[model samples]
Target: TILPLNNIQGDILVGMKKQKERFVFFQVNDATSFKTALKTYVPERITSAAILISDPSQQPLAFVNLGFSNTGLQALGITDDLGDAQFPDGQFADAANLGDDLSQWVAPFTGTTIHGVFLIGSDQDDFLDQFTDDISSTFGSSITQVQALSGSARPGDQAGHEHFGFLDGISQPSVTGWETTVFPGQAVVPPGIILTGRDGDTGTRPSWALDGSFMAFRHFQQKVPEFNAYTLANAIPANSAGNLTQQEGAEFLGARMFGRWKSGAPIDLAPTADDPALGADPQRNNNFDYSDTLTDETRCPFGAHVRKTNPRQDLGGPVDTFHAMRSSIPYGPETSDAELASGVTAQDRGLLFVEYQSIIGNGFRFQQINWANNANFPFSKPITPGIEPIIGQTTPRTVGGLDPLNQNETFTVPLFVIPKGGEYFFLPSISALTATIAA
Candidate 1:
């Protein structure tokens, strides 16, 4: 492989896969001192993809990744443009454009004070706490916490699922030269879509920026009780055979909105019912594209979250440019019984959404604005597809193709997924961290 897997962050390519991950957002108080500390501290602690992949049993107890905001770069006395329009201003600057509600954002994400984020992952909370304390002590007043967010795998069968009770992080693009292993239905994208100076990337950036990727960090608050109530209230009618129960219908409706079952099986393949065996089968789970039923919505809704996000053959060509490496984890506890009984949520819980791309405009922003929010997407369809039912940030939410028997039937839904806060940071390569940044 031409790519330097060791120099790249472990999470960028393969992922840390820890049970717990902490996002420590911090601001730099002293650039020189922070830079000096980074020289030895960063190189010693940074986890590499090669380390994680070469030997699984020898894996470290914890992993660390460092990312910098536009202002963080400026504070470090590096004023050179990174060539990405979106990276220069940060995510809060484009909140309205991305359908984010500033009122819902946390205090740390409301302004431009956040300079960087330290991503630490471990299985033990105590170890993570100790590491975080070590970071605080080592930085020693050179950096201060802007905010910190933590996420962990759900308990038992719910482990890999998001707060909304759907299996998550199943779909991701495979880097051509870097990722050697392949599975069914994996899109083989050029390296440039992820790495800065690779084949498909069109941006002109500094030499030191090579091998780096832009990270979009988002905090999504999922309303589980409300969403369950909505689905229960408006469960789709069963077919003439009447074999499906109301509960099954509700689950089916939820699956249609996600274009997959809670087990991660794509509904495009298993239309009428969820095949948990299919969902867990790596070879069969992501096998089907909408190409088989390009003009049909009976299998998967046009406005389904997965279909809207990827759209596969809907655009009539390869969409490798828009591919993003998603490494998100679910946060918060399971839904409380009292909240479930009241059909309301009192505690905070959702997804800690993180993705890496070479260009923010072409990747995450493009998908959200052009595909999810746009009603007329999957253009020239027999019927007008409405906003994405799961994640679309449009008012008067409506989606088409929920009922297979009735192609024209539409459903009005609430916005269950909300973007509470987020930021865009540049994940520099390990070499860049050691030499360019620390130097």
Candidate 2:
């Protein structure tokens, strides 16, 4: 069946987003007042089904998607369990296992439960600030700000890349029925893969709960200097002549470790060298599925970030079942010469990782717990694949296997991207916003 995209938020479909965005988390001081404010905000929110997908990033546009925590749902007398399992426990509960940095994590995430978050994306910072102020004022005494996060895409040629300097948000799955156009190489997923109450969505839900998706938000602070320094120092295969620049070896190691070049080219396909042309081309960039090198890691290691996260058909499990709509933005600014040379960072720089899925257990949590965290993932490997080189974290620390340079030796992976904190939220459909909670 065709899912009602009109009831869904725009961000899920438009995974690759604007230059700037803001995450506004708030707690409900008064449920009645909060509901009234939502009723007024509902009509103004733009839905994914109506967004013009053809347009590029030249024009500045701001779109909002509202999500509520389990507490937020209960605030409006929604006692019926939304049946979200990973939720309720919240993100702070697993801070240690997930490798969250407590010092950097903001309030609400520190302990206090946040009711909901308004995810606002635009091309300008001033407009986001003005719009956020207006919404904050409108809520008045009804709500209190829990935490506010700001993120922006890197400027100029660095537009689509993350702080890690890797091209991000490339490889999103195409959904059927609602998607009018599918780029070459994009997999067409079932409606239920992303939307609740559709095919693959198990259990019965309230009619009002039909169109929403589960959102998993995470704050990551990257240790740029440390990461660059480590990769440069530990540039594998040994530069015998001792004249290779960090740009060549360190960047290649980063690419092999990440499964993609900084330019966004996948190492599996372009194993020997970085291809700037392929990385920038939409039609050619995400086209390969790693089928050619499925049995070996001679090109890209099995433990590579992209490979572990999405093994395509390399593993036994259904890959598409765990697909998510990634909507992320790089936070903070560019690395300075002082920080780079000294190997110490004074500023916070990383990604505001956000994903929208039909279910938490089946999608985001499952990916993190089963795929990324599991050292034995990407089944049928000669040795353990190890924790994801970039995001995966563990207590004892682990090493990645099948090194591109030294096939016999193992390489250790550090906590490159540190998770600060986040939450599991359910974004309600437009009809639900109007009929049940608002009513």
- Largest lDDT belongs to which candidate? 1
Q: lDDT tens string, model 1, 1-439?
A: 3889988887888888788999999999999999988987886788888887877687767889999999999999877788898999889989899887778887789877899999999997998888888788789889999899999999999888888789887888899876577788989988889989888999988999988999999999999999988888878777433656789888888898899999999998888888999998888898878987688787788889998889898989777889999888889989988887788988989989898999998888888989898889878898878889988887678888888778698888888888988999999999998778777
Model 1: worst 10 consecutive residues (lDDT sum): 236-245
TM-score of each: 0.98, 0.93
- Our tally of clashes for model 2 stands at 0
Clashing pairs in 2: none
TM-score of candidate 1 against the unseen true structure: 0.98
Provide the lDDT at 87 for model 1: 91
Per-residue lDDT over 174-196 for candidate 2, one digit per residue giving the tens place of the 0 to 100 score: 88766475766677778677877
Q: What are the root-mean-square deviations of the candidates from the true structure over C-alphas?
A: 1.3, 2.7
Q: In angstroms, how far off is 368's CA in candidate 2? A: 1.3
